[PDB]
Amino acid sequence: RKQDIIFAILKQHAKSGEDIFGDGVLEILQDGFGFLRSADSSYLAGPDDIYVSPSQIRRFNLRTGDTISGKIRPPKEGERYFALLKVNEVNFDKPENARNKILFENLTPLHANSRLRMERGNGSTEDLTARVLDLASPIGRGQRGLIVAPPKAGKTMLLQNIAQSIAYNHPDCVLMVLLIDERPEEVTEMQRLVKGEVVASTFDEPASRHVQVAEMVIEKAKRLVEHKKDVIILLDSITRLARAYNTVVPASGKVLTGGVDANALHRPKRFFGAARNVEEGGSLTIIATALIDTGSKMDEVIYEEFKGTGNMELHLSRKIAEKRVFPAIDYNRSGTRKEELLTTQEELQKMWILRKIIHPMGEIDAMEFLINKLAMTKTNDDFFEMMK
Amino acid sequence: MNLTELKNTPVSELITLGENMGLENLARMRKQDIIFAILKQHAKSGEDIFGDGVLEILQDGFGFLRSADSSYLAGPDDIYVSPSQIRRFNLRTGDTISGKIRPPKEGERYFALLKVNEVNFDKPENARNKILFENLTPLHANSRLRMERGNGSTEDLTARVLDLASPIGRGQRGLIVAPPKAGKTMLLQNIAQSIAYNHPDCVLMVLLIDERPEEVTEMQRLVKGEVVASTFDEPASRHVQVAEMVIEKAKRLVEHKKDVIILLDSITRLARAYNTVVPASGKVLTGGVDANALHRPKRFFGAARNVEEGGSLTIIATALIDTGSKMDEVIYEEFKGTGNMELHLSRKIAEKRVFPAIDYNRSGTRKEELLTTQEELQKMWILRKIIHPMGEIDAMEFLINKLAMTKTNDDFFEMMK
Amino acid sequence: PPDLRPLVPLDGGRFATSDLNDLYRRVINRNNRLKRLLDLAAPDIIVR
DNA sequence: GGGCTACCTCTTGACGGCGAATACCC
DNA sequence: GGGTATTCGCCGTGTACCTCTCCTAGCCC
RNA sequence: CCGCACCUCGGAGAGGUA
């Protein structure tokens, strides 16, 4: 109802002669034209979307994901969308700065160089999760990891803790938590808890909207990276997204074990590998949560295929989660490749000694030891100094 | 007017040149489109344009000239090759063609080839009369390709251990068997650097299929040679196409008495790609391997051979084991009885941070007497008989402590007696 | 309406399309071409 | 051999006779 | 301004029924 | 369908019939 009221108000205001302003993310269709979707509707096709002529797209070399803000006009007799007259701001910047840009496909990838420390530093009991995460698997800019965990392991609490630690330590980073095929109540809870942008697509609509929202989000992330921004995407839907792609892919006659199409894992693997660290400027970090032991062999095949792709695995133990010990992290199975590029020599040596001491002990025993050692102090520096 | 020369030029200079030529705004344009417009404007004046690339004959009969900087990917700037010229010069997939080209006219989308100037970096009169690769007489490794640096560097220890464990010659067909997280990347980097340093005359080609883009751009900026790779973001079809183009180029080079060296790091990934692209036949073996899926990787591996008339083809593939997938285990067990060199790496030694973590016991080379002298072979036999009783970690520590004392292995062998 | 100008159902992938459908397709093609060309601001001769 | 899409070539001829384009004077 | 030579090509093909045939593969890729 | 091995339904043309 609000959209029709705004439409009528804008019409009455344009009848007087005043200017009308709009904003939205561009979604170029296959025919050549596009529309400016809205953020409050999770990039959903609305009746009051702003039409974008192909002439302006050719003039400014606009692509899917470009945030466009400019003057619009109400539709005339025979039109159903707002025509874009003049664009004022492109991607929160002037068009003269966006015209001389380098495409995302030409950026040179690199390994994680900058250290994104997750430790809060306030000495809270909730900071233990971030401390264990930093001790087990340090995360840097451009990291491409996977949160491997069975159902009912603590993915929600761990994701909330990660989001809060990111918003606390690194408020300059653009945090985007894209939740696909999840409960609406959980979406509402997350949106009113984390300090950032929350786009979601619940199961109430088919997988086409899921794929469309995923494409819009990845295009916006690529454009922001092109504009020298540090984008961090926490997509806890990678398994759901792979299921959606396998459901919407045309049959090719080559079905793998478990009901997986031969060309179904192409789009999600490309979405995952899109994350990379750019040397010219900016980075893209994608932390996804994979589902295992869900009773379906399709998810097992998806996990086994995506295991050889990322460079960071955070395994969670079902036993430790059932014992109500959070975070229930499998320290032995966790780790990060090329960790010497994110940690110093002494920090790497301390982590190596801690792993050599923890490995002989059992999972529950190692977790109890780590908790008892971290409870004695507030910062990990005192723990490191006492271990020696 | 060469295509590669304009491809090596930066974006800023090309934009400046295009603006000086008086064309549409090139700032909001792709570099390839800028080069295309510059070539069009330069050909409108009447001047000639030249290009080059590797030929890829299609199934219909025509073909294109792929570029090496794009990993033989389908580009808009590919030079069309009519089947008439193919039938006139007996061209095949892999022949390097360099000749005059022209921009596409109205209704065309690719450059056309008018006159071919150089074939396979040689005169066409020498290429018209040649012996096919399938007719060359194979032979064992005769020439010794020593990997030792000799500069006394600390990184030369890996090359020294490799020479003491498995010497490599021209035409060798080996396998680098190692579980994940063992150090295959550093070992391959050291091998490539030692090959580029000791034998700069050989054509080095590093194939990386289904790997991370960061590792690709790292290897491309580290080794002194050609790097053709295909990240995991590409389908298995592109993997198969790249493998076919690389092996065809290698065969065409060997046909001209050239020493080609191929450092494969994805034999397992290549076999997985071939098993994915093969149509289902309703018969699946143990582990999920098709009956006719391993034939193409089998031929790709067996293509390596030493030619008596001239040239050689060396293929060093790194196989993956203990990856948790039975398919890779079946692939490794099938390819084990095929090659003639196995360099095993131990995960237990890699966990102790003892680099390099090489399993000296299971390593070895068949017909090693053809690449080493009598006294050298006797010293290697004595060293193996001394190392065999000791454990793997203990033998590795002993070898490292004994090689750290001297610079050359000859002094170590002389001190052992 | 489409029922008054239907496609003749015959065996095979080919179809002896009605002349009216062919004319409508040609008109739609020639209209979409002009619609996409008028935004590009083509020279007057081509537009005419 | 093929994708949406574009090139083949010509200023059925008589009429049966009816209304009417440019023309020649009265 | 009008009454009429030539003429550019403007629309009727008896009615009903029966048998048979013809029905796109092109281009630089 | 994931791994063999025991110790406490159409358009044009041709021919014909009344």
From Swiss-Prot, chain A:
Residues 19-94 form the Rho RNA-BD domain. The keyword Secreted does not apply. Its EC number is 3.6.4.-. Changing F35 to L/A: Defective for RNA-binding. GO terms for molecular function: ATP binding; ATP hydrolysis activity; ATP-dependent activity, acting on RNA; helicase activity; identical protein binding; RNA binding. It comes from the Bacteria. Keywords: ATP-binding, Helicase, Hydrolase, Nucleotide-binding, RNA-binding, Transcription, Transcription regulation, Transcription termination. ATPase activity is inhibited by bicyclomycin and dihydrobicyclomycin. Residues 32-37, 49-51, 79-81 are annotated as: RNA-binding 1. ATP binds at G140, R141, G142, Q143, R144, G145, K152, A153, G154, K155, T156, M157, R183. InterPro entries: AAA+_ATPase (IPR003593), ATPase_F1/V1/A1_a/bsu_nucl-bd (IPR000194), CSD (IPR011129), NA-bd_OB-fold (IPR012340), P-loop_NTPase (IPR027417), Rho-like_N (IPR011112), Rho_factor_ATP-bd (IPR041703), Rho_N_sf (IPR036269). GO terms for biological process: DNA-templated transcription termination. Changing K155Q: Improves ATPase and helicase activity but reduced termination activity. GO terms for cellular component: cytosol; membrane. Facilitates transcription termination by a mechanism that involves Rho binding to the nascent RNA, activation of Rho's RNA-dependent ATPase activity, and release of the mRNA from the DNA template. RNA-dependent NTPase which utilizes all four ribonucleoside triphosphates as substrates. Belongs to the Rho family. NCBIfam families: PRK09376.1, rho. This is Transcription termination factor Rho.
UniProtKB/Swiss-Prot annotation, chain B:
One of its GO terms (biological process) is DNA-templated transcription termination. Changing D265N: Loss of ATPase activity, helicase and termination activity. SMART domains: AAA, CSP, Rho_N. Residues 284-288 are annotated as: RNA-binding 2. This is Transcription termination factor Rho. Changing F64 to L/A: Defective for RNA-binding. Gene3D superfamilies: 1.10.720.10, Nucleic acid-binding proteins (2.40.50.140), P-loop containing nucleotide triphosphate hydrolases (3.40.50.300). It holds the Pfam family Rho_N. GO terms for molecular function: ATP binding; ATP hydrolysis activity; ATP-dependent activity, acting on RNA; helicase activity; identical protein binding; RNA binding. Homohexamer. The homohexamer assembles into an open ring structure. Its EC number is 3.6.4.-. ATP binds at G169, R170, G171, Q172, R173, G174, K181, A182, G183, K184, T185, M186, R212. Residues 61-66, 78-80, 108-110 are annotated as: RNA-binding 1. Facilitates transcription termination by a mechanism that involves Rho binding to the nascent RNA, activation of Rho's RNA-dependent ATPase activity, and release of the mRNA from the DNA template. RNA-dependent NTPase which utilizes all four ribonucleoside triphosphates as substrates. Changing F62 to L/A: Defective for RNA-binding. One of its GO terms (cellular component) is membrane. The record marks K326 as: RNA-binding 2. InterPro entries: AAA+_ATPase, ATPase_F1/V1/A1_a/bsu_nucl-bd, CSD, NA-bd_OB-fold, P-loop_NTPase, Rho-like_N, Rho_factor_ATP-bd, Rho_N_sf. Residues 48-123 form the Rho RNA-BD domain. Keywords: ATP-binding, Helicase, Hydrolase, Nucleotide-binding, RNA-binding, Transcription, Transcription regulation, Transcription termination.
Curated annotation (Swiss-Prot), chain C:
Acetylated on several lysine residues in the presence of glucose. Belongs to the RNA polymerase beta' chain family. This is DNA-directed RNA polymerase subunit beta'. The RNAP catalytic core consists of 2 alpha, 1 beta, 1 beta' and 1 omega subunit. When a sigma factor is associated with the core the holoenzyme is formed, which can initiate transcription. The rRNA transcription and antitermination complex (rrnTAC) consists of RNAP, NusA, NusB, NusE (rpsJ), NusG, SubB, ribosomal protein S4, DNA and precursor rRNA; S4 is more flexible than other subunits. Co-administration of salinamide and rifampicin or salinamide and myxopyronin suppresses the emergence of resistance to both antibiotics. DNA-dependent RNA polymerase (RNAP) catalyzes the transcription of DNA into RNA using the four ribonucleoside triphosphates as substrates. It comes from Escherichia coli (strain K12).
